[PDB]
Every structure is written in structure tokens, then in C-alpha cells.
Design a protein around this ligand. Structure first.
Ligand SMILES: NC(=O)C1CCOCC1
Lengths: 237, 300
């Protein structure tokens, strides 16, 4: 059934499992027309498909041409997501295919279940966790590859950089969700924290800065403060 | 007009015959039911006074043989049997009629209810859903499970309704996943109508039989089947116009006949709200929507 705080360490066991987040698949800007009506313009999007054990991210870029001439795009986007996830699974060797796929939004359950009928042994699960994967487009290198795409494309990343050399996947996921939660709550401040010190750089082959263990503790503390702050600035506390 | 005699009535029981019912007291001199209309299937059903658990009954068609009821004190129920000696049977019935020990099937002349509930129901199809080939009649009870229920446990005692499953490879063409799931016309028209049922008459007959088993026996898997067969039509954008018109009539008479007090358990809120108000056919069931809104507005 659903994934929650009770069964949380199941994410970090050796069974292959993927989270799928569809919140950046169909993206639009809303604007006025010359006649003073409202219209939307789609921009490139992405499926965020992640292994929480290894950190491997399968970023399927959704080019705006896939929407041309189609109706009911928000509904189509869920089906397109499930089509692409199914295609990804079929492309993987049997021993790399997931035993579970956890969708971050319950509206993905039926589309994914229908597209995965050929895989009856892969469990399709919701979650009660409120995960901040929508903020993936606040990671500069991910946003850059999505916006630059001129055609459909899959790009593979490790969202943990080299962290697993020094920390466990439980701790790496906790750091990732803290960073993304911060970027979601106050992107400007979060990004200031991450780059304020120009002597700490992002390696060409990485997504985040090359912090030492001690610097990550400072960074992590700064992100918690930011989240608590904004939570006050929000509710006034 | 045909007759189903009873050897005796040794235990107190409520006896149904189609939509009618009457109480028989323990050892009351009751010897059966006469004046049963020829041309229709019928159901004779039982609920014991001491154990309302297990409503049970027998589907039959008097054109196919001479049938009677006899209580079995070992198995503890009223059993239908066939009498092969036609002269013995005629002689039995005539004696019981002369002594006026039979109830008359109490059909009002104006009244087409039973026809309207059984229009497409055929004994030959009932006998494929309920498999017991040595008898010409079919036993059903409250507890019998369906083939689909068993997939999710005695096979000989199952209701072999046609399995409908909207999230199945049968229902969903590879490469048409979204199309087939949101518009079930393929599954309805090619898979089920052309492929399995052959025609809409057989589809409606199974739908009507499922409803009647749900209503008369409280058979839960039958209720599931009835709703699934409605939903499959309503969730199809492309349905022959004669089928939609006939479905509206079928459902109208089913809703009309349902006991007002059993609507809570026999009607699935989700299916009916979807069918009447959201589905492709939301505007095609005028008679059914009107009776539902006036009789069960709470459900909606
Ligand atoms: N759970 C995984 O994705 C990996 C962990 C160990 O290497 C092979 C499977």
C-alpha cells in the first residue's frame, strides 16, 4: 500500500524501486491575448524518476511539441508520464527493473497501472510523504538541460553527486529532501546559502557544491533555519 | 399455465415466486403454486423462518420439464426435482388443485413487470452461468461466489459470470492505453459484444440475471456483476442507439422493483453517480435518471 513515515527505511533497502514525480511534466506560462483574453504557452518539462538507494535520476525531458494539437493537456500529461516510465522500464535489463514504483501524486496511479499491465509483479504505490521533487527545476543544471532541449531526450544524473562515498543513502536522501524543501519554500534564499562562498565550487560532473563534511553541517543548519523562518514569515510566528 | 407442486411443507418458510412471496407455517397443508405463466423463466425461492441466513432458490422454465419441490430433512432445505413420469405428475397436480391446496401465481393482467425484468434472460444461458448439467433447473443462494471473486473457493458451486475488469490486458489495447481506459467502446463492442456475448441480447440477459440474483438472494458478487455491466456501457462513447434505449428500459424496471429499504446495500453510489452524471451516456438514460432522482435522491 501507501508509503509513509512508518515504512520509511524501506526506501534504503537493496530492492530496486523508483519514485516518479510528474509535477514538472506539463508547464505553462499564462498570458493575455491581444483581444484581452487569456492563453497559455507551454514550456519544456520533465519527468523526475529517481532511485533513492543509488541516487540515479532518469530525467526524461518533455519537449513542447508533444502537446501540439492535443486536448486536455493536464490529463494527457499523466498518461504521457506513465507511457515514458513504462518505456524506461522495458529499456532496462531485467535485473535493473524496479520491484516497486512510488508515485508522488495519487492521480498517477491508474495511468501507470494501465501502462504497466505487462509487468504484474511491479507494485505501483502511492505515498503519504509530501516530497519536494517539484523543486527539481530549481537545480540550475537540471533546469538548463530541460530549457535547452529541442527534441525529446533522456538525461541521466546522480542527484547525490559523490555523497554516497561518505554517507548512507538514508542520510543522502534526507539531505536532498532538505535542500529541495528549502528551494521550494524560498528559492532565492536557498540558492544564496548554497553559493554565498565563492571558494566552494560545483564540479563540472556534479549538481551541488563540493562541501566538506563540516560545511554540509553548516549548510544543512542554514536550510533548516530558512524553512523555519519562511514558516514564520508565512503564518506570522 | 403450469404448476410446481410441493410434496409438503414441513418447516415454516417464506416462499417467493418471481417478485411475489407468501408465508407458509410449519406443517401447513400447502401443496404448491399453480397458474405460472408460460413463456418466461421463473425463480422459486426460500427463506426459512428460523434461519433467515441463506436465502436460496431455483431458476426454471416449465417448458423444459415437470418440476416439483420436496423438503429434504437431511440437507435441511426445499429441493427442486424433475418428475419424468408425466402421468404421475398430471395426476398429482390435478388432485392438489381439486383439493385447492395451491396458491395461484398472482399476476395482474395489466402488469408486465416480470416480462420487463426477464426480457433477455434464457434458461440455456442461466445453465452456463450456474453449472450443474444433470438438472434442467439451477440453484442459486446468498453465499455463492463468482469466478471473478474466486480469482481474488469451490469451483462447482460458483457463478460463472463473464469476467469484466477495466484494468486488464483484455480491456486495454497495447498502444491505446489512455484511449481505451477513458473510452471503453473497444472493450464493450469488439471484446465483449462481438467476441464473447455475440449480441446485445445475451449481454442484457446476463445483466438482468445478475440483478435478479442480487435482489432475490442478496448475492454480493451478482450485484458487482450487474454494476460492472452497466458501467461498461455508460463508460463507452460509442454504443448502438438501440442498446442505450433498451438499457434505459431495463434499468428503469429494475430500479422500480427494488425494495425501497434495500437500496443502501444493493446500489453502488459511485457507479450510479458516474453513470447518470459524468459518463458519456449521462444524457441517454432519461427514464432511469428520472426514477432514480424521485426514488433515491439521497444516493445522488
Ligand atoms: N537497489 C538498487 O537499485 C541497487 C542496490 C545494489 O545494487 C544493485 C541494485
Amino acid at each position: 500500500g501507501a508509503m509513509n513515515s512508518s515504512n520509511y527505511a524501506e526506501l534504503f533497502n537493496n530492492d530496486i524501486k523508483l519514485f516518479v514525480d510528474d509535477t514538472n511534466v506539463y508547464r505553462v506560462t499564462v498570458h493575455k491575448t491581444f483581444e484581452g483574453n487569456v492563453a497559455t504557452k507551454a514550456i519544456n518539462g520533465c519527468i523526475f524518476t529517481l532511485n533513492p538507494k543509488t541516487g540515479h535520476l532518469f530525467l526524461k525531458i518533455i519537449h513542447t511539441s508533444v502537446w501540439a494539437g492535443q486536448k486536455r493537456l493536464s490529463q494527457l500529461a499523466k498518461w504521457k508520464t506513465a507511457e515514458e516510465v513504462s518505456a524506461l522500464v522495458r529499456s532496462l535489463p531485467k535485473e535493473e527493473q524496479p520491484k516497486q514504483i512510488i508515485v508522488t501524486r495519487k492521480a498517477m496511479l491508474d495511468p501507470l497501472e494501465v501502462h504497466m499491465l505487462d509487468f504484474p509483479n511491479i507494485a505501483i504505490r502511492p505515498t503519504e510523504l509530501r516530497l519536494p521533487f517539484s523543486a527539481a527545476m530549481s537545480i540550475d543544471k537540471l533546469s538548463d538541460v530541460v530549457m535547452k532541449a529541442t527534441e525529446p531526450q533522456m538525461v541521466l544524473f546522480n542527484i547525490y553527486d559523490d555523497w554516497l562515498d561518505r554517507i548512507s543513502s538514508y542520510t543522502a536522501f534526507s539531505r536532498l529532501t532538505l535542500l529541495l524543501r528549502a528551494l521550494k519554500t524560498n528559492e532565492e534564499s536557498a540558492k544564496m546559502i548554497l553559493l554565498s562562498d565563492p571558494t566552494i565550487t560545483i564540479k563540472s560532473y556534479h549538481l551541488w557544491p563540493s562541501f566538506t563534511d563540516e560545511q554540509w553541517i553548516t549548510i544543512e543548519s542554514q536550510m533548516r533555519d530558512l524553512i523555519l523562518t519562511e514558516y514564520g514569515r508565512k503564518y506570522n510566528v | 399455465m403450469n404448476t410446481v407442486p410441493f410434496t409438503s411443507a414441513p418447516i415454516e418458510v417464506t416462499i417467493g415466486i418471481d417478485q411475489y412471496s407468501f408465508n407458509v407455517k410449519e406443517n401447513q397443508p400447502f401443496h404448491g403454486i399453480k397458474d405460472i405463466p408460460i413463456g418466461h423463466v421463473h425463480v422459486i425461492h426460500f427463506q426459512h423462518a428460523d434461519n433467515s441466513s441463506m436465502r436460496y432458490g431455483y431458476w426454471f422454465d416449465c417448458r423444459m420439464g415437470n418440476f416439483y419441490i420436496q423438503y429434504d430433512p437431511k440437507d435441511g432445505l426445499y429441493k427442486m426435482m424433475e418428475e419424468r413420469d408425466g402421468a404421475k405428475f398430471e395426476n398429482i397436480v390435478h388432485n392438489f388443485k381439486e383439493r385447492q391446496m395451491m396458491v395461484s401465481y398472482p399476476k395482474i393482467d395489466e402488469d408486465d413487470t416480470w416480462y420487463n425484468l426477464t426480457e433477455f434472460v434464457q434458461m440455456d444461458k442461466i445453465r452456463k452461468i450456474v453449472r450443474k448439467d444433470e438438472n434442467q433447473f439451477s440453484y442459486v443462494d446468498s453465499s455463492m461466489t463468482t469466478v471473478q471473486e474466486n480469482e481474488l473457493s469451490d469451483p462447482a458451486h460458483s457463478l460463472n459470470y463473464t469476467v469484466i475488469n477495466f484494468k486488464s490486458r483484455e480491456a486495454i489495447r497495447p498502444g491505446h492505453e489512455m484511449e481505451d481506459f477513458l473510452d471503453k467502446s473497444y472493450y464493450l463492442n469488439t471484446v465483449m459484444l462481438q467476441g464473447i456475448f455475440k449480441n446485445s441480447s445475451n449481454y442484457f440477459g446476463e445483466l438482468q440475471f445478475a440483478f435478479l440474483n442480487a435482489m432475490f438472494f442478496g448475492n454480493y458478487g451478482s450485484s458487482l456483476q450487474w454494476h460492472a455491466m452497466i458501467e461498461l456501457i455508460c463508460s463507452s462513447a460509442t454504443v448502438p442507439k438501440h442498446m442505450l434505449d433498451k438499457l434505459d428500459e431495463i434499468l428503469y424496471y429494475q430500479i422500480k422493483t427494488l425494495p425501497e429499504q434495500y437500496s443502501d446495500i444493493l446500489l453502488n453510489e459511485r457507479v450510479w453517480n458516474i453513470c447518470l452524471y459524468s459518463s458519456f451516456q449521462k444524457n441517454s438514460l432519461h427514464n432511469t435518471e428520472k426514477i432514480m432522482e424521485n426514488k433515491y435522491p439521497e444516493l445522488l
